[PDB]
Design a protein around this nucleic acid. Structure first.
Length: 66
DNA sequence: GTGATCGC
DNA sequence: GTGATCGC
């Protein structure tokens, strides 16, 4: 789908938006957890460098009642 | 610090 | 129990 390129521990990796489990904002930072080959990894990008698909995911989280 | 979590 | 981690 949409791939998010992000740096974690120097590593300039990426993840498919379909692997992202959880999304949340901390200011202008968009943070998330994703299913890493059967594991949970973490990641974060600036809201500016976020593809619209990641901001839609966040939009869904923010309007959620759970 | 912050939200949220992993890794220890 | 909580340090690093991510962008600011």
């Amino acid at each position: 789908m949409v791939k998010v390129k992000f740096k974690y521990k120097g590593e300039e990796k990426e993840v498919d938006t379909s692997k992202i489990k959880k999304v949340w904002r901390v200011g202008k930072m968009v943070s998330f957890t994703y299913d890493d080959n059967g594991k949970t990894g973490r990641g974060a990008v600036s809201e500016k460098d976020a593809p619209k698909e990641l901001l839609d995911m966040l939009a869904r989280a923010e309007r959620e009642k759970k």
